[PDB]
């Protein structure tokens, strides 16, 4: 019926404490989604080109050239932390939980409303909105994951984080195949390097369509759609950070002489000369046993080529790295490769009363200390004569290939059988929750964007489209675009995301770091006088844990 | 006639490979456009050898690496191979799927 | 901005300037979000000597 509501708005986070210290967390999110009709009812194949930018020698890092199928449909993506948890709930979770499991996910659409804009021809323009009770909203649910997976948080296009603000969906578009060549150059590179877009190789063409691969439900003003509960199987996400590096693994050396009076200069002394110490070292030609040369069980962290660009059929891409930098915690402005930087708009955290289109930005300096500090590690000759000379060492200050600004660490990879690393920490509120595992026979060990990875499947993507509202002059034989009555839709989206977490237990004398309100961040969690809201980034691994 | 074997190179249809002339390295500062001192192009020599560039000694295999199994080759391709006796075993074999 | 007429030179344009775009990148010291610097889930393929 038109006058009977088909659902209830619900945005309450529930905690239900189970046996053995586990907590059943239910995050109900509810939004009002506004949807305009598509620009055109037809699928487009658009080749986006920015050769003007890359035509300038040395700008190869600014390539946006690609090919995309632009579709008339719109994607309703809720794969972002902010959509589910308000700052207080996240504070509770990070301060008192230790591990997080993704349990279930369900979503539904109700109170579908379709309206048409009749723009009067009156000399002073005016427009009246009318309820078209017969219009239909097409809802498609890719339950079988037939369509390409296109997470929205990567582009900051998920639903809004404010329950009391209407949100808009994102027009769905998926990459089409293409070939590209961008020979790197630098300021001073003579001529124009080879920069060509070869087009689409026929063997790799895929042209998906929702109308052909997904059943489509037509919802009038009195209808509702529910996706049913989806159950995850993702690995647990740890809410604790590791501080121990190789230098802090195992039994420390025995201090034969200990300080006698408190002070900043009263250090402990091992006493025994370095060459006469007792231990085990992987270096078989030196008797010097040191805190640096001692044998650790394995390697915590791996050095990777940083700011290295790799070319493939589609052009250049930046090599990802799964660890943060060392010493970047001192200042966010001193961040470097590996620290994820998020840019977001007024829907996703930026002060809602800000003027201008400049996105709000922040670099997330993770609390885990498993990264690398390239200025430190060096290489020296096998003879290990000490002190080393210029001919027997390769310091980070040394050039490679004659380039004064590029040193050896830029092309150094220490990933090996002994490498150990942690999963990506959650980022609030702009961070993604789950991601799909790759279809490759051999699959990546971890993803750099989401902490939870679907082993089998992720929930089907939800697509919404205002059904065509034809005028009486329609003619399919006309090459011109279809004439449509201006129409839009407002519908309420309600989702339930269920987590399971473990409550932390104190295991040390000293307290641990905790998220708290303070005089500096006070006014970042309350509205301004003109209704301005914001959601600042919050750290998710404040509690430490021992690695070995 | 003759003992010259018949030869062919199997260019697999999968597009998960790399194009060494493309990918490059640049300084962390990421000042743009990059200058000579802040980039290491594939045209740059390593150790003074004009024909050997940095991609020859570059390994990007890491925890995020993903790859596909070897495609079958007909008719001369092998079908099955034995897994190694090593305690830690290779992820895939380059000769049999 | 999408093309209006079919042709080999009618490409689509993103419109927004590179430095003012919205997204996530693993590079924490650049505001330039590009089709190359954007963060992908993982790495398909590996360069080897």
């Amino acid at each position, epitope marked *: 019926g038109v006058g009977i509501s088909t659902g209830t708005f619900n945005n309450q986070t529930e905690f239900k404490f189970l046996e053995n210290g586990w907590v059943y967390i239910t995050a109900n999110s509810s939004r009002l989604v506004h949807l305009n009709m598509p620009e055109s009812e037809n699928y487009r194949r658009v080749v986006v*080109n*920015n*050769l*003007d*930018k*890359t*035509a*300038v020698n040395g*700008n190869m890092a600014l390539d946006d050239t690609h090919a995309e199928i632009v579709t008339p449909w719109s994607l309703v993506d809720a794969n972002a932390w902010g959509v589910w948890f308000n700052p207080g709930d996240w504070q509770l979770i990070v301060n008192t939980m230790s591990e997080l499991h993704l349990v279930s996910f369900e979503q539904e659409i109700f109170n579908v409303v379709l309206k048409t804009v009749s723009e009067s021809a009156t000399q002073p323009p005016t427009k009246v909105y009318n309820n078209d009770l017969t219009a239909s909203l097409m809802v498609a649910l890719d339950s079988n994951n037939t369509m390409p997976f296109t997470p929205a948080a990567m582009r900051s296009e998920t639903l809004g984080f404010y329950p009391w603000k209407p949100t808009i969906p994102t027009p769905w578009r998926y990459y089409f195949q293409w070939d590209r060549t961008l020979i790197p150059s630098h*300021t001073g590179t*003579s*001529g*124009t390097p080879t*920069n*060509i*877009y*070869h*087009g689409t190789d026929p063997d790799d063409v895929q042209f998906y369509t929702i109308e052909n691969s997904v059943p489509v439900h037509l919802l009038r003003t009195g209808d509702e759609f529910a996706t049913g509960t989806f159950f995850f199987d993702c690995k647990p996400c740890r809410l604790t950070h590791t501080w121990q590096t190789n230098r802090a693994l195992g039994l420390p050396p025995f201090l034969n002489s200990l300080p006698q009076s408190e002070g900043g200069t009263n250090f402990g002394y091992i006493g025994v000369q370095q060459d006469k110490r007792r231990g085990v070292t992987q270096m078989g030609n030196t008797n010097y046993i040191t805190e640096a040369t001692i044998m650790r069980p394995a390697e915590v962290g791996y050095s990777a080529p940083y700011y290295s660009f790799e070319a493939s059929t589609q052009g250049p891409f930046k090599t990802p790295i799964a660890a943060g930098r060392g010493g970047a915690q001192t200042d966010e402005n001193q961040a470097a490769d590996g620290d994820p930087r998020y840019a977001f708009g007024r829907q996703h955290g930026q002060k809602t009363t800000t003027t201008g289109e400049t996105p709000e930005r922040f670099t997330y300096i993770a609390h885990q200390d498993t990264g690398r500090y390239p200025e430190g590690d060096w290489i020296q000759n096998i003879n290990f004569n000490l002190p080393v000379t210029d001919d027997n060492v390769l310091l980070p200050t040394d050039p490679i290939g004659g380039k004064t600004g590029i040193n050896y660490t830029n092309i150094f990879n220490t990933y090996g059988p002994l490498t150990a690393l942690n999963n990506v920490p959650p980022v609030y509120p702009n961070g993604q929750i789950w991601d799909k595992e790759f279809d490759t026979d051999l699959k990546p060990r971890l993803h750099v964007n989401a902490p939870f990875v679907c082993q089998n499947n992720c929930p089907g993507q939800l697509f919404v489209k205002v059904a065509p509202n034809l005028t009486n002059q329609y003619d399919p034989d006309a090459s011109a675009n279809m004439s449509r009555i201006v129409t839009y839709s407002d519908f309420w989206w309600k989702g339930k995301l269920v987590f399971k977490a473990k409550l932390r237990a104190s295991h040390t004398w000293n307290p641990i770091q905790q998220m708290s309100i303070n005089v500096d961040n006070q006014f970042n969690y309350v509205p301004s006088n003109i209704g301005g809201m914001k959601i600042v980034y919050e750290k998710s691994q404040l509690a430490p844990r021992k690695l070995y | 006639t003759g003992e010259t074997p018949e030869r062919f190179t199997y260019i697999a249809h999968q597009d998960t490979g790399r194009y060494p002339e493309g990918d490059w390295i640049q300084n962390i500062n990421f000042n*743009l*456009p990059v200058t000579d001192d802040n980039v290491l192009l594939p045209t740059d020599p390593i150790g003074g050898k004009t024909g050997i560039n940095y991609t020859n000694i570059f390994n990007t295999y890491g925890p995020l690496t993903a790859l596909n199994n070897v495609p079958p080759v007909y008719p001369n391709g092998q079908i099955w191979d034995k897994e190694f006796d090593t305690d830690l075993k290779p992820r895939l074999h380059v000769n049999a799927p | *901005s999408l093309p209006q007429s079919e*042709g*080999g*030179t009618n490409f689509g*344009y993103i*419109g927004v*300037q*590179q430095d003012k775009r919205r997204g996530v990148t693993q590079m924490g010291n650049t505001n330039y979000i590009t089709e190359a610097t954007i963060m992908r889930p993982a790495e398909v393929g590996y360069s080897a000597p």
Partner: antibody, heavy 130, light 107 residues
Framework: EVQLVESGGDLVKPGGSLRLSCEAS????????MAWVRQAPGKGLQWVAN??????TTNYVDAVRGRFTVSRDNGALYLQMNGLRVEDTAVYYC?????????????????????????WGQGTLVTVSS | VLTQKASVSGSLGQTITISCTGT????????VGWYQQLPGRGPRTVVS???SRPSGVSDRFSASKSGNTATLTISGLRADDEADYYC??????????FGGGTHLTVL
């Protein structure tokens, strides 16, 4: 249709300064590299300067190098002229430099390039004398 | 400066050719563009490489490039073709280089 309109041409004294403008409409002005090209009375075309699509780099000819400057504001082009000399008297035009060239008739594949100007403005006359 | 012929002349309906020349190190690797210049008008792009014409340009124009030389062919002269023709390109010294022009004329 693409529209480029120049303005600012006027009589000026030698050794002074001036500002010429090139307003653009009907196309994505920010997606195209731009160029200032001058022609003296009855003489051939002479390249004055050029600027990229983001202002990262600008290039000049030796005659105006160190004297003039070029800038853009996403809506129009500007040429700042300093140290004007008698020979500078000429008509100036703003043209889009074709940054892409398709290599097939339907032009499914395209390549980067330089040295071809696609669209031109109307042009403006600058006279420097007493 | 690229080399060009000062002028040419021909009868109506004749298919004619004009040439621009320069060092292959600059005219070779870079593209070449041909523009028309009528009295009381700014240069109009007639040929933009790959034998492709801008919209609104008569199909009579054609162009080709070979090493040091670039050739522009007109398939049948018309009274409105009496005008200056200008070749331009990019130069590996990071310049934009034009020719001296050629005043096409009709007998």
């Amino acid at each position: 249709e693409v529209q480029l309109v120049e303005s600012g041409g006027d009589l000026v004294k030698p050794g002074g300064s001036l500002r010429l403008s090139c307003e653009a409409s009907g196309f994505t002005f920010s997606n195209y590299h731009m160029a200032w090209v001058r022609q003296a009375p009855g003489k051939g075309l002479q390249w004055v300067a050029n600027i990229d699509s983001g202002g990262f780099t600008t290039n000049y000819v030796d005659a105006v190098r160190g004297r003039f400057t070029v800038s853009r504001d996403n809506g129009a082009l500007y040429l700042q002229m300093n140290g004007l000399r008698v020979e500078d008297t000429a008509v100036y035009y703003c043209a889009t430099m074709k940054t892409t060239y398709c290599i097939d008739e339907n032009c499914n594949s395209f390549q980067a390039g330089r040295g071809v100007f696609d669209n031109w403005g109307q042009g403006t006359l600058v006279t420097v004398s007493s | 400066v690229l080399t060009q012929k000062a002028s040419v002349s021909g009868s109506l309906g004749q298919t004619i050719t004009i040439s621009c020349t320069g060092t292959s190190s600059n005219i070779g690797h870079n593209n070449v563009g041909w523009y028309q210049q009528l009295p009381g008008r700014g240069p109009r792009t007639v040929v933009s490489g790959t034998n492709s014409r801008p919209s609104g340009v008569s199909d009579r124009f054609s162009a080709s490039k070979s090493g040091n030389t670039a050739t522009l062919t007109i398939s049948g002269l018309r009274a409105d073709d009496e005008a200056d023709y200008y070749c331009s390109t990019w130069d590996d010294s990071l310049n934009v280089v034009f020719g001296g022009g050629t005043h096409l004329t009709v007998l």
